[PDB]
Amino acid sequence: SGFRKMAFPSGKVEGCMVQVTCGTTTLNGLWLDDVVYCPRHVICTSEDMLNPNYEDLLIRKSNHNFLVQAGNVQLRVIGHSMQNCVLKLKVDTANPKTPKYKFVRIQPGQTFSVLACYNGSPSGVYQCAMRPNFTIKGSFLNGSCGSVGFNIDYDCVSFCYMHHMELPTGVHAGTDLEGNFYGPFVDRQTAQAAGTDTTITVNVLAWLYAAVINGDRWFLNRFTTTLNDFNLVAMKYNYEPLTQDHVDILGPLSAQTGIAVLDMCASLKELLQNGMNGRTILGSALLEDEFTPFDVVRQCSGVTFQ
Amino acid sequence: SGFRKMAFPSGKVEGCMVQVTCGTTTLNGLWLDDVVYCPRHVICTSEDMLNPNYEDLLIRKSNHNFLVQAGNVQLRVIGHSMQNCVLKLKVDTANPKTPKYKFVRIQPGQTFSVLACYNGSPSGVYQCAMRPNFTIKGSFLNGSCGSVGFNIDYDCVSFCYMHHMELPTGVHAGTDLEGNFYGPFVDRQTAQAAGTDTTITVNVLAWLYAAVINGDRWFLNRFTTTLNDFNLVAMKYNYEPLTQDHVDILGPLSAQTGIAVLDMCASLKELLQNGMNGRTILGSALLEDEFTPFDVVRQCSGVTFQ
Ligand SMILES: *[C@H](O)[C@H](C[C@@H]1CCNC1=O)NC(=O)[C@H](CC1CCCCC1)NC(=O)[C@@H](NC(=O)OCc1ccccc1)[C@@H](C)OC(C)(C)C
Ligand SMILES: *[C@H](O)[C@H](C[C@@H]1CCNC1=O)NC(=O)[C@H](CC1CCCCC1)NC(=O)[C@@H](NC(=O)OCc1ccccc1)[C@@H](C)OC(C)(C)C
Numbered sequence: 001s002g003f004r005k006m007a008f009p010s011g012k013v014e015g016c017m018v019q020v021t022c023g024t025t026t027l028n029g030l031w032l033d034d035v036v037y038c039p040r041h042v043i044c045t046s047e048d049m050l051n052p053n054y055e056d057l058l059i060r061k062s063n064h065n066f067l068v069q070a071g072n073v074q075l076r077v078i079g080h081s082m083q084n085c086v087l088k089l090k091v092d093t094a095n096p097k098t099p100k101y102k103f104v105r106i107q108p109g110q111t112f113s114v115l116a117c118y119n120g121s122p123s124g125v126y127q128c129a130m131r132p133n134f135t136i137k138g139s140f141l142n143g144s145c146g147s148v149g150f151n152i153d154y155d156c157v158s159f160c161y162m163h164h165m166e167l168p169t170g171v172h173a174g175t176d177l178e179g180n181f182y183g184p185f186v187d188r189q190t191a192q193a194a195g196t197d198t199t200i201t202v203n204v205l206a207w208l209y210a211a212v213i214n215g216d217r218w219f220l221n222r223f224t225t226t227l228n229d230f231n232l233v234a235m236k237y238n239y240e241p242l243t244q245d246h247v248d249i250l251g252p253l254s255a256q257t258g259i260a261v262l263d264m265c266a267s268l269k270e271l272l273q274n275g276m277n278g279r280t281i282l283g284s285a286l287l288e289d290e291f292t293p294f295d296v297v298r299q300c301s302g303v304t305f306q
Numbered sequence: 307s308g309f310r311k312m313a314f315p316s317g318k319v320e321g322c323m324v325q326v327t328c329g330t331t332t333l334n335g336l337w338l339d340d341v342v343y344c345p346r347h348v349i350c351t352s353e354d355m356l357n358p359n360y361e362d363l364l365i366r367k368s369n370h371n372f373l374v375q376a377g378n379v380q381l382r383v384i385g386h387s388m389q390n391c392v393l394k395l396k397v398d399t400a401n402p403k404t405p406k407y408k409f410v411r412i413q414p415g416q417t418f419s420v421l422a423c424y425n426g427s428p429s430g431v432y433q434c435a436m437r438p439n440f441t442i443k444g445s446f447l448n449g450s451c452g453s454v455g456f457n458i459d460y461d462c463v464s465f466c467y468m469h470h471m472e473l474p475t476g477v478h479a480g481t482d483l484e485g486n487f488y489g490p491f492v493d494r495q496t497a498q499a500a501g502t503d504t505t506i507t508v509n510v511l512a513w514l515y516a517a518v519i520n521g522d523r524w525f526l527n528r529f530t531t532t533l534n535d536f537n538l539v540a541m542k543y544n545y546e547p548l549t550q551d552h553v554d555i556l557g558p559l560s561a562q563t564g565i566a567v568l569d570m571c572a573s574l575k576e577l578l579q580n581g582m583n584g585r586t587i588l589g590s591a592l593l594e595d596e597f598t599p600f601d602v603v604r605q606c607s608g609v610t611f612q
Contacts, residue, residue, distance in 0.1 A: 001476045004445040006430035009421065011317030071612075115315065121610035124312035125431060137589070139310040141608045170307045170521060215476060283443070285591035302447045304427035306377075 007113035015097030019120030021067035028146030036089040049189040084179030103177040112149040129290040134183025135171040200289040202246040209253040223266040313419035321403030325426030327373035334452030342395040390485030409483040418455040435596040440489025441477040506595040508552040515559040529572040
């Protein structure tokens with residue numbers, strides 16, 4: 001028992017991280033087979049950053065402008081192309097550590113592990129959620145661009161995030177691995193703000209189930225509620241609407257604990273209306289929303305990865 | 307910016323995990339050079355567990371009683387010895403993925419990453435602290451014994467924990483990698499309880515510095531306090547005494563933020579006496595104590611690992 005903010009084991013991704021230097025910019029790249037993926041703003045200079053035209057910028061580049069360092073090994077760029085906001089550097093060597101992988105674009109509310117890197121070297125791993133406003137609340141300093149987010153499914157690494165930038169509230173924005181930003185953000189250093197965020201309701205409910213699975217039951221009640229009546233309460237507290245498909249996803253957890261989804265909804269409704277009143281759930285005094293239903297089932301039943 | 311509960315990259319440890327089966331017990335082992343380390347209770351049967359004499363139990367074992375599985379590769383045990391509460395299985399193959407490593411026994415209040423494993427396969431990685439009562443608040447199910455905790459220092463993996471057991475409050479106990487339990491616990495299935503825990507004061511102060519480094523300043527004040535006067539307040543709220551050596555450790559953080567340690571102590575003192583009053587620090591409504599001063603400096607300046 002117990003319940004922790006748990007990241008996937010990061011070994012399969014660590015074997016893909018490289019350093020990419022161009023001009024005065026150094027950031028991280030992802031080395032899969034003979035291609036290195038990195039943010040296209042690696043080709044911007046300290047004054048191109050305001051309104052860059054990346055097609056012009058890139059056509060002025062030669063392959064030898066790109067310094068790719070894989071550990072103590074300098075990799076030779078033999079070609080480059082831009083796909084949306086990511087640069088793809090064709091290199092002459094296939095990464096022998098390339099895992100089985102996929103590129104996926106995730107939905108808001110889904111979670112992933114971030115492998116924070118600097119100069120091609122991993123610094124730390126942590127769990128994130130794609131917030132409803134398409135930012136992530138990460139931990140990223142200068143040089144971290146090109147760090148990736150990912151999920152592991154048995155043996156397959158699904159990459160879903162590459163880091164590009166930090167917004168003024170301290171939260172983070174980036175793209176999928178095909179270079180499409182999450183959210184309305186653009187890589188260009190003009191004024192942008194995150195947009196109002198909301199709480200991921202289905203995830204809060206999954207975490208309340210995690211709590212029950214782990215012996216916290218003090219927040220439960222006899223009441224039930226209708227989805228309609230729950231969603232009126234959610235709105236007022238800035239929670240995502242709970243859909244019927246959310247309710248279905250929560251089915252396994254509901255069945256394992258014997259608490260009907262709409263009953264947990266009545267519990268959450270009282271937690272929103274009364275607060276927690278000096279009590280904690282799973283070591284938190286806040287309602288936690290960065291565990292998906294799958295996250296809860298995985299950690300509470302012990303799924304592993306080869 | 308941002309601040310997350312950050313684990314070390316787990317690749318170096320994942321390459322050491324193996325499955326160890328003996329009788330009807332399966333758990334995890336740590337494969338370093340030609341030795342596999344695992345909990346000695348792997349040799350207990352479902353009724354030896356009450357008052358086992360492990361010397362008798364082990365002398366009745368033959369090497370071929372130990373099934374060691376390294377992926378799709380069955381490893382041959384050529385010898386075994388017991389060291390305190392860990393079994394060491396000599397195997398005929400050196401692990402080619404053996405990292406640079408050390409075995410360290412940590413002090414309470416120190417943090418580490420746990421690589422949760424089942425059947426030799428990593429399930430997830432998360433950050434822990436050795437609690438003052440020598441338990442860890444982990445996430446561990448049946449089959450997780452033999453999972454290890456560790457810190458990484460540049461290129462060297464310092465192993466500090468191996469998982470052995472779960473106590474009735476849901477927290478966890480285990481040993482260092484030389485088999486000495488943390489705390490008064492013994493591997494034997496008789497009544498044991500954790501003992502009263504306390505809050506790791508120096509870590510709370512480091513996290514308050516993390517908050518300042520990241521733009522949270524609402525909890526600061528003009529007051530100062532004496533170490534003596536602070537510790538009278540700490541005691542009443544079940545906090546570890548803050549030593550002068552703690553104050554010294556907090557020096558770099560103090561110098562980087564311009565907030566004298568004893569001034570942060572005045573802030574913590576008011577947080578204890580008034581609570582947070584609907585406000586959060588670094589996304590928490592609780593005072594967080596599982597970041598050491600080194601953890602804060604590492605994450606707020608971007609140290610990496612080769
Ligand atoms: C790559 O390693 C870094 C990672 C950042 C740095 C600190 N934390 C991080 O995660 N990325 C950057 O430094 C990028 C680089 C530009 C990206 C766009 C195209 C040109 C290169 N810049 C930023 O992340 C800045 N954010 C930003 O410009 O956002 C738009 C904006 C501009 C002006 C006002 C409001 C919003 C960061 C570094 O600037 C602030 C921290 C001041 C927001
Ligand atoms: C190894 O994979 C597991 C890991 C446990 C299982 C669930 N969570 C975990 O982290 N370890 C065990 O199952 C060990 C095995 C024994 C260890 C001692 C020597 C013999 C083998 N057992 C326990 O962890 C039990 N705890 C325990 O016995 O503690 C002492 C005790 C006994 C009786 C009353 C109070 C305290 C667990 C499984 O039992 C409880 C969960 C009921 C505490």
